[PDB]
């Protein structure tokens, strides 16, 4: 009987029996140009056929859904074996999804005698509808998205050259306070995205005796995460005119300059990585100006 073998071309990449046509993430952005080459054998020489192609979505739920269809009139060459090309044009194919080409060729004329009277009574119908044929299959590649970990910030304030610690606040002597207090902050980060830029906003808070907060200073710098998204940054608030007997604490917020997380499963990055350390009771971030 008559047979069809098929080979899909998706954005210029061909499928084969061992491997599906891979469409790069970059090429999927403007849609995918899909064509199919049909190798026919044992058709009837010089006869016309109606060739119907279908681009099927091999859905994760186990179903096949039609995405495109094209019907055209084609003619079998002398000796009944040759090749036809069917073009689906540009298709908006989904990232991470697999699609397969189905082909059906039906003769325009009756070419088969099914009752042995020499009078032809049935069309020649040949198809290739195999969801497992890798030669007919394409896969739209997924982007390599950043491995976003749970980001953390640990901080240590430095006040007039004295480090804060978890055990004790940075104690600034009265002598040291007389000419203002030089305040800087060490930010130890982990779980950020290597080589990405972040907006680091440090805010020096006055923690009053009632526990209430008041912004004394704020500085905002552009910083880049290091190797493996772990490292150290600094924020220098400069010379601060701090009040004797009062307590101050450093807050830190780091926001990725770009979207680094895909939170709606469409493969497009839509959320920034935000990491903060806003603890009014963390002694490592606290300084106290000592009384005379």
Please give the residue ranges that form the binding site for Ca ion (CB under 5 A). 11, 27, 30, 113, 115, 117, 119, 121, 160, 176, 179, 262, 264, 266, 268, 270
- Give the pairing type, strands 98-112 and 137-140: antiparallel
Burial class (CB in 10 A: 0-12, 13-18, 19+), 157: buried
The nearest distance, CB 112 to Ca ion, in angstroms, is: 8
The nearest distance, CB 158 to Ca ion, in angstroms, is: 12
The nearest distance, CB 258 to Ca ion, in angstroms, is: 13
The nearest distance, CB 287 to Ca ion, in angstroms, is: 11
The nearest distance, CB 181 to Ca ion, in angstroms, is: 5
- Bridge-partner residues for 154, per DSSP? 188
The Cα angle at residue 9 between residues 8 and 12, in degrees rounded to 5: 170
- The residue among 51 and 124 lying less far from Ca ion, judged by its C-beta, is 124
- The residue among 117 and 222 lying less far from Ca ion, judged by its C-beta, is 117
- The residue among 130 and 262 lying less far from Ca ion, judged by its C-beta, is 262
The C-alpha atoms of residue 11 and residue 219 are separated, in whole angstroms, by 49
- The residue among 174 and 218 lying less far from Ca ion, judged by its C-beta, is 174
The nearest distance, CB 212 to Ca ion, in angstroms, is: 25
- The residue among 11 and 133 lying less far from Ca ion, judged by its C-beta, is 11
Half-sphere exposure of 238 toward its Cβ, with a 13 Å CA cutoff? 5
Q: Which residues contact 80 (CB under 8 A, 6 or more apart)?
A: 40, 41, 42, 43, 44, 45
- Residue whose tokens read 């130890």: 188
- The residue among 113 and 147 lying less far from Ca ion, judged by its C-beta, is 113
**CB-based contact 148:260 (threshold 8 Å):** yes
């Amino acid at each position: 009987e008559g047979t069809l073998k098929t080979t899909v071309a998706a954005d210029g990449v061909n499928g084969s029996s061992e491997k599906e046509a891979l469409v790069s993430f970059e090429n999927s952005k403007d849609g995918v140009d899909v064509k199919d080459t049909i190798d026919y054998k044992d058709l009837v020489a010089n006869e016309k056929y109606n060739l119907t192609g279908k681009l099927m979505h091999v859905k994760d739920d186990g179903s096949l859904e039609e995405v495109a269809t094209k019907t055209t009139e084609v003619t079998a060459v002398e000796n009944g074996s040759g090749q036809w090309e069917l073009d689906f044009g540009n298709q908006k194919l989904q990232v991470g999804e697999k699609y397969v080409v189905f082909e059906n060729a039906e003769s325009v004329e009756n070419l088969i005698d099914t009752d042995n009277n020499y009078e032809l009574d049935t069309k020649q119908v040949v198809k290739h509808e195999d969801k497992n044929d890798k030669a007919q299959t394409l896969i739209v590649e997924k982007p390599n998205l950043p491995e976003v970990k749970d980001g953390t910030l640990r901080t240590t304030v430095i006040a007039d050259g004295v480090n804060g610690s978890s055990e004790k606040e940075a104690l600034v002597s009265f002598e040291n306070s007389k000419d203002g207090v030089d305040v800087k902050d060490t930010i130890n980060y982990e779980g950020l995205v290597a080589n990405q830029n972040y907006t680091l906003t440090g805010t020096l808070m006055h923690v009053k005796a009632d526990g209430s907060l008041e912004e004394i200073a704020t500085k905002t710098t552009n910083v880049t995460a290091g190797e493996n998204g772990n490292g150290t940054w600094g924020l220098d608030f400069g010379n601060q005119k701090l009040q004797v007997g009062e307590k101050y604490v450093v807050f830190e917020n780091a926001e990725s300059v770009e979207n680094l997380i895909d939170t709606d499963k469409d493969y497009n990055l839509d959320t920034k990585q935000v990491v903060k350390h806003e603890d009014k009771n963390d002694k490592a971030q606290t300084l106290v100006v000592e009384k005379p």
